[PDB]
Symmetry: C2
Subunit: 445 residues, 2 copies
């Protein structure tokens, strides 16, 4: 049946995928032709942020549209026994629910990480009200399992011999699209890749091993990523394993793009590609940005963001205006013709910015007391307003001020030479910490 | 719900798989641990026959329980334009239908080859009345396509990146078993493997390449099965490609065995493993038997046959009594508590033989006029009674008589030295040819 429908929203989020990994973000070693095509057909954001440097909190910010620091989940959820924290369906109108109330059929394929209690799972995707829950974790994901049978995903009872998890998740996204082709749907495709431990089909690893050898010289893939290197992690840039895993994600995104064309849904479907936090040390490529996962330096919070909506969003555009994972909830609600019912949101509707509208300045905030990692040197809070970013560290207490425009690698601390800017950003950060009841860092007394 | 049900019947048939390929049949190069376990848990037949040396006719004999020569399909069905032959659902009560009438839910996963007209497909598995038709050919299978997307199987619209066809078919068998666990079912698992062109996942090919090298010396896999060898076919015994394809079949049979245990169906399920014709020249291993596919010599018609029915059939038994693919229809009907309604059958109920009963002698017959292959030297008819087998050839007209007990490789023709036995078998063969209206071979006038 033809006629106006509210547009499908497909949200594709990689796990721990760095800002410097995609071909569109300047990477020449990895191959992401499908994502680069999605980029040439959409708007690419160079200053997109996860609202936290770790899994659970960014996922919290997406499903609640609220500051992780306000929710009280600022660090990844560990195994059940190491935490009393979970996302409570009675405490938030989640994004899937707001879309349900706007006439959408809702689906999650894969990683939740908003409840690590599997005995009762009161805060699982089903309990939050997803119409379809497909291949979500059935136990603490931990170091992972990427090959059928998937030891972390009991609900994937059926599969083929040595089936790769990324390939499975992307096939389930295709079938979900086809089953639900006739009505508005929200599909949250929550990839386990590229979370350590790094695993990819041998032929893809062999391919990037040889490409590593061609780039660096004969034997270099064995020298740096041989049987010796058990987790395939190194200080060498260009990781054949992450490249092979990113090729499986990329080929998967191409299957979804193909399925949308075939089913006639491309013209009325919003496609977002995002990552929940910065690249992981010894695995990920955050380009020239400082540090990565678990740090509030740019490398831990800067993410690839591609938004495609054919004939609504101009193709092959680059947007430098800062945005965060808080912005998705109000953006999807505007596209769905919905209004937040009582629900308060800490993000802003991006649809006017996506349609070529002029940008508007707003302070952006982060808080990482590392309640789970206990990373004393990484414990910190941050405000960005304009090009200035202020980081407050709690162990070795200090302020760091960077001009991200002139110093995007955060290599020159300005706090001392620019005290009035420092004092002005400190006041915004302190006010925000009281507004959200920011959790004190876990340090000695 | 517990209580007596008629037993599930799972019929697993490989394409063009030779008598000498399985570990249980003496092969040390290939690895078939799951099938060898099925063998240690069932009855293994050393003198089992396909009723024809080619695909379509053997499949005809299975679904009709009638001599291929009586049906009028004695050679494989070519593409639509090269044939007016098809199996007509209005001319036979097919096996799936006889089981339906005995209270079974019926399923085919894969190859039919009983209709090559895809414009109308009047003689397809659905038209013959299978409740579930899964991954059947949507066009002439020809040289094949073993990797998703499967160019010969349009109904496999959904799949993962570079999914292997054998792995897919065996996963679909598992899900079929699970969906239908509560009621009696017949599953015809009709594998496309190991039909040329030989294709298998690289890691399995690499594995048997190295094993070939270990057996024959360094470089020998490249020497005989390198980039040079496009179809991976050779005169060398031990083919890394067929071994890798047979390992995928074997691992698949293990998944089915596992699924039956998990679902509690192993105690009330009959498992048959069979092959539709002898191993293919330049690909298959027919051990010491003469020739292979398209010949009525033992290599073209002798098949692996393992029947498992825990606590009804004695485990780890070897049965030397001759049986054929004609025997399946009446055997499955007896196990289903059914009686052929009007339908005439050319085979015999094996259930008394499977339960440890004494064997009974019966003449067995073949006719190959090669209406499709046009193989003038291979065109022939054959009778086996006891250990004596008489072959009649039409091009270079002659009788060949072999004592298969003392001469299983058919290397010593006895027709001249044993004229009275020859004349006696000639009379049975001629009578049978008139009984079934045997099609004259396609030769010059
Ligand atoms: Br219409
Ligand atoms: Br994590
Ligand atoms: Br540290
Ligand atoms: Br200043
Ligand atoms: Br202050
Ligand atoms: Br019961
Ligand atoms: Br054939
Ligand atoms: Br010949
Ligand atoms: Br004689
Ligand atoms: Br005669
Ligand atoms: Ca993550
Ligand atoms: Ca065959
Ligand atoms: Na807990
Ligand atoms: Na809720
Ligand atoms: Na696994
Ligand atoms: Na035809
Ligand atoms: Na019929
Ligand atoms: Na293919």
């Amino acid at each position: 049946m033809q006629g106006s429908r509210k547009p499908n929203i497909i949200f594709i989020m990689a796990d721990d995928l760095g800002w410097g990994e995609l071909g569109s973000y300047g990477n020449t070693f990895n191959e992401t032709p499908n994502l680069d095509r999605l980029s040439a057909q959409g708007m690419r954001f160079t200053q997109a942020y996860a609202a936290a440097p770790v899994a659970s909190p960014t996922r919290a910010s997406i499903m609640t549209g609220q500051y992780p620091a306000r929710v009280g989940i600022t660090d990844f959820l560990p195994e059940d026994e190491k935490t009393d924290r979970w996302l409570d369906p009675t405490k938030y109108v989640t994004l899937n629910e707001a879309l349900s109330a706007s006439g959408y059929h809702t689906g999650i394929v894969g990683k939740w990480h908003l409840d690590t209690d599997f005995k009762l799972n009161k805060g699982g995707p089903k309990a939050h009200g997803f119409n379809e829950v497909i291949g979500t974790e059935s136990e603490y994901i931990a170091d992972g399992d990427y090959f059928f049978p998937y030891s972390k995903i009991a609900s994937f009872d059926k599969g083929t011999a040595n089936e790769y998890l990324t390939d499975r998740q992307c096939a389930e996204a295709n079938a979900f699209i086809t089953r639900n082709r006739e009505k508005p749907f929200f599909l949250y495709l929550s990839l386990y890749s590229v979370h350590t431990r790094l695993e990819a089909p041998v032929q893809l690893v062999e391919k990037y091993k040889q490409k590593f050898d061609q780039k660096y010289g004969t034997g270099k893939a064995e020298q740096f990523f041989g049987a010796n290197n058990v987790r395939h992690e190194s200080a060498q840039r260009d990781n054949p394993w992450l490249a092979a895993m990113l090729e499986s994600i990329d080929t998967g995104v191409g299957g979804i793009m193909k399925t949308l064309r075939e089913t006639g849904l491309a013209e009325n479907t919003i496609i977002v590609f995002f990552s929940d936090n910065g690249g992981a040390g010894k695995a990920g490529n955050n380009a020239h940005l400082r540090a990565g996962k678990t740090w509030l330096y740019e490398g831990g919070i800067r993410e690839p963001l591609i938004v495609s909506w054919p004939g609504k969003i101009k193709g092959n555009t680059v947007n430098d205006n800062p945005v965060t994972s808080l912005d998705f909830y109000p953006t999807f609600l505007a596209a769905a013709g919905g209004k937040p019912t009582g629900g308060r949101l800490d993000g802003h509707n991006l649809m006017p910015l996506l349609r070529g509208g002029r940008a508007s300045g707003r302070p952006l905030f982060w808080h990482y007391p590392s309640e789970t990692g206990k990373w004393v040197n990484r414990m910190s809070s941050a405000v960005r307003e304009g090009n200035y970013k202020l980081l407050e560290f709690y162990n070795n207490p200090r302020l760091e001020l960077y001009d991200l425009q002139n110093d995007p690698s955060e290599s020159h601390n300005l706090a001392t030479d620019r005290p009035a800017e420092t004092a002005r950003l400190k006041k915004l950060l302190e006010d925000w910490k009281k507004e959200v009841n920011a959790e004190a860092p876990h340090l000695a007394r």
